[PDB]
Design a protein around this nucleic acid. Sequence first.
RNA 1: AAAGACCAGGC
DNA 2: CTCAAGTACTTACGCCTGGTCATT
Lengths: 98, 82, 48, 48
Amino acid sequence: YNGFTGRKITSQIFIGPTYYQRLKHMVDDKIHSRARGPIQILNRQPMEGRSRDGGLRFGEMERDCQIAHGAAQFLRERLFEASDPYQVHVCNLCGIMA
Amino acid sequence: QANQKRITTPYMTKYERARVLGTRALQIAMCAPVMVELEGETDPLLIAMKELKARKIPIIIRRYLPDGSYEDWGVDELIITD
Amino acid sequence: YARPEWMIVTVLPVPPLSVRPAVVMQGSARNQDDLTHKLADIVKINNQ
Amino acid sequence: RLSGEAFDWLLGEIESKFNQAIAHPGEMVGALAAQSLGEPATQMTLNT
RNA sequence: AAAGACCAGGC
DNA sequence: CTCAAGTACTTACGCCTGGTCATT
Ligand SMILES: [Zn+2]
């Protein structure tokens, strides 16, 4: 019988006690959210892993998929603005930083 | 190139539409004067969309040709895909 | 831009501390990057 | 058995749809083709 | 604690 | 001097979770 309306379900349901096991994989230990957290010491990029409040990785395949979109500045944000932004002062005569 | 002899599609590409809408929305959200009249529209994105539908966006698109030349198309001159 | 004799290392660049960061050991000690250790070896053998 | 007004509307729709189907300049065709080629390779069997 | 390695595991 | 037939480099999915261990 339908739980909501009380009407008999037209199809007859296959019901019986079946052994089920709960798994270690549980959402409370897998959910992660990142918003300008800790950064790496060397690359000054978001850390690695859920436990270190690290950011998700926007891998090579990700940028290729975004290039297929033709999403230029979303890619620029993902790879420059959302991740490590930086400014350098470079000479005009030589192309080397000053 | 000159205003005469323009060779591109008169239709505006979806990439041009997306970028011009983003730029106009950013300008509107940074206190730029609105072109179309707004009926209780506090969201700059919908304001920019309404501006596009009215062909009032004050932007000209510089289409770079592969040979190094360029052509200037106003959003009003381009005909909306939608 | 690039001359043949510049391809023989006579002056070795020393990367800045950003390239080879040191890790603060609770403020008591300071470990060094692998690049720093290689630089130490190079300076030792060069002085010798 | 189309009528004249129906035929005119059909011509207009043909023109509009064909103009819509034209590839938009600026479209990244290389990456799109590479992905459209590599995606079926995932579902393809390694054995012959 | 830092990056390094190894291991196990999810899709 | 100059052609085919042997010896060196260079690379093999995408993330994601964690636990342990030796140096520092
Ligand atoms: Zn200079």
